[PDB]
Amino acid sequence: EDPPACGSIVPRREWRALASECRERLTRPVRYVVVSHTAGSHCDTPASCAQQAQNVQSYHVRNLGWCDVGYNFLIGEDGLVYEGRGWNIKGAHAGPTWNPISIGISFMGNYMNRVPPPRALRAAQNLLACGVALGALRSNYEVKGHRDVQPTLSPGDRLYEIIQTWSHYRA
Amino acid sequence: EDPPACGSIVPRREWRALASECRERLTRPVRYVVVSHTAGSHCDTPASCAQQAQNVQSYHVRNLGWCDVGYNFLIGEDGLVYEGRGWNIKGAHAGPTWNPISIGISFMGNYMNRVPPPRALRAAQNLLACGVALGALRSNYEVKGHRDVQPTLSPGDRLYEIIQTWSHYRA
Amino acid sequence: EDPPACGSIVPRREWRALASECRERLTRPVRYVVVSHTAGSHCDTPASCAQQAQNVQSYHVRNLGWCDVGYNFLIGEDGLVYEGRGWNIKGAHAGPTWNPISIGISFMGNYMNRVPPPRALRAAQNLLACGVALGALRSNYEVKGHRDVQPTLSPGDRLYEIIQTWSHYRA
Amino acid sequence: EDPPACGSIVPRREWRALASECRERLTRPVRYVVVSHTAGSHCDTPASCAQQAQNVQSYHVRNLGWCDVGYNFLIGEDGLVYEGRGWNIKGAHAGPTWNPISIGISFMGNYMNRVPPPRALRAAQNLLACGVALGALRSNYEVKGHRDVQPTLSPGDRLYEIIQTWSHYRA
Ligand SMILES: C[C@@H]1O[C@@H](O)[C@H](O)[C@H](O)[C@H]1O
Ligand SMILES: C[C@@H]1O[C@@H](O)[C@H](O)[C@H](O)[C@H]1O
């Protein structure tokens, strides 16, 4: 029961998401953070990004039949963090061997030959710090690239190149 | 990484702020937090809100002749916190009585007949948390409305209405 | 494909290890072997050793917050070999440079001024034969002392004198 | 504040160190300090201590092939602090997770069953004080024992008790 200053996330209700049907739990504290991109359209306004959020979720629920948006958190170029499955629920984002032991945050857009705006990157790092503050992540958490845990170009050449310079990125 | 979980603050360099020339320091740790509103135009996108912060500052500088924008921090309806004088430079937002002992945060726009979006209110409270963590604010910091410390209509009926709701608000 | 049996290794399950969280893997055939000691208290029975193994691991994962006991294997004076991270998962025993290119077997005890029993040396020398037969080690693997790659007394003077004698030892 | 303020540190060239080859930089203000012990022999004269520093260095340099002695600063029982790689160069003293966010100070000697002389203990505190005065160390910095972040007997049972008494110790 000790929260030492977290960070500000846009609530599910706010971006008008569909109700989650997920019930599987992620045992705290989490050791790995897997970064990826949605390979979708980017948005740079709280308005546009709220929409982007649902398109991704509806695509995961309505078409892939998952219980909720696959990622735990979403990052927008508007500089806000959109709440996915959150800290407590296991998500579907990086394969069966990795989904149970990691939090998956995904930047909204296709960063293969484009870079996230400084605020996007800030929001993401800040988010992780809150994680450690809340104890959802261990202090020695490890940030891994999506392409480091499975065959995919995600999170995109330019964004990947960037997260490799992060304090907690492990080979 | 500005020390702990400091809820993504937009740097001076990012909103193209004029160089500050103030040099009166703030006696750490501060006890009060005065809230206000610029009573100017409100903005709802990072793009528009950076352009607005610029307007506010150039006005305090080019026209009023102050060493820099008067507030320590500016909050946008874009749900982002814009760096002003910061946690260490004494502001110019609530008179000679309160400037040297409180931190000043202003919401961009006029909140007499308008209400700030939740993402903005969220950004502010999240800003104060990072305040304590940093040691710039007393864990037992008290929030006052601009009205409470100076004869002014700011922070606008509607917004003042809400800050009284804050657990740290005093009379 | 015709044996090769050399697996006289006590399984993690058998000494009641904690669930490992480690996921990075070594590439067969591993070229180097780094011998170290735990600088702790020794054990000369299958009972006291399973105890000591739980201890070393308890320290690594509970105090150091590591994904699992850092060694790949642990040799006891009871003449047995205790499965640590095994032949496939990169251990954490000699640093960022050697961890990826080697396997770390560690003698449970402090041999600064003691020589391990002949049955422990045998167990170790024997374990290495395994690696070769299974293909986990290059037939021409090189043995290095812990102090040879890191600032430490490990594996102890007496034991170090011994390993310098080994045929696969190398500069 | 007020100057000059710092302590008495024996310059690198005074103990005739070999030219550092390290280029990786630390980011001040540093948050953590890791106390360790060379585990080797002690010295009680500027004469023998200046010699010791070299032994340690040559060992980390030509035996391990490192860019310089692993520690940022070395403490001698002569009552002096020997400059290691200093306040700005990342050292190699406590693993890849701590080297980038800490300053490594090592007491030359072995303190498993030997306490350091008051002189040594003062040199160490003065150093840290001087580190805060210089903006090299964060004011609320935290101290940790080598063994708290890595598998090692260091800094020695005796010293470990001594530092666990410090106002900045936090494990
Ligand atoms: C072609 C493929 O398309 C999507 O799955 C992503 O953008 C991925 O990164 C890219 O490699
Ligand atoms: C007195 C003060 O003047 C300006 O700052 C604005 O009009 C504000 O709303 C008003 O309260």
PDB file of C-alpha atoms and ligand atoms in Angstrom, chain A residues 37 39 110 112 152-154 156, ligand 1:
ATOM      1  CA  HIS A  37       4.255  -0.458 -32.635  1.00  0.00           C
ATOM      2  CA  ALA A  39       1.789  -0.512 -37.468  1.00  0.00           C
ATOM      3  CA  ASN A 110       4.274   2.598 -38.041  1.00  0.00           C
ATOM      4  CA  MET A 112       9.696   1.684 -39.711  1.00  0.00           C
ATOM      5  CA  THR A 152       8.580  -9.287 -36.721  1.00  0.00           C
ATOM      6  CA  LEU A 153       9.894  -5.936 -37.753  1.00  0.00           C
ATOM      7  CA  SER A 154       8.151  -4.301 -34.819  1.00  0.00           C
ATOM      8  CA  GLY A 156      10.045  -0.493 -36.442  1.00  0.00           C
TER       9      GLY A 156
HETATM   10  C1  LIG E   1       5.342  -5.801 -42.735  1.00  0.00           C
HETATM   11  C2  LIG E   1       4.986  -5.710 -41.248  1.00  0.00           C
HETATM   12  O1  LIG E   1       3.686  -5.046 -41.128  1.00  0.00           O
HETATM   13  C3  LIG E   1       3.260  -4.919 -39.730  1.00  0.00           C
HETATM   14  O2  LIG E   1       3.076  -6.235 -39.160  1.00  0.00           O
HETATM   15  C4  LIG E   1       4.319  -4.103 -38.924  1.00  0.00           C
HETATM   16  O3  LIG E   1       4.471  -2.785 -39.484  1.00  0.00           O
HETATM   17  C5  LIG E   1       5.676  -4.811 -39.023  1.00  0.00           C
HETATM   18  O4  LIG E   1       6.635  -4.055 -38.290  1.00  0.00           O
HETATM   19  C6  LIG E   1       6.087  -4.901 -40.512  1.00  0.00           C
HETATM   20  O5  LIG E   1       7.368  -5.581 -40.630  1.00  0.00           O
END
